């Protein structure tokens, strides 16, 4: 569950 800015857009951390 990568919620980083580099990993992608707004994700459900």
Helix (H, G, I), strand (E, B), or coil: what is residue 7? Answer: coil
Residue 12's CB is within 10 A of a number of other CB atoms, namely 5
Helix (H, G, I), strand (E, B), or coil: what is residue 12? Answer: coil
Residues near 8 by Cβ (< 8 Å), separated by ≥ 6? 2
Residues near 11 by Cβ (< 8 Å), separated by ≥ 6? 1, 2, 3
Distance separating alpha carbons of residues 2 and 4, to the nearest angstrom: 6
């Amino acid at each position: 569950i990568c919620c980083n800015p580099a990993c992608g857009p707004n994700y459900g951390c």
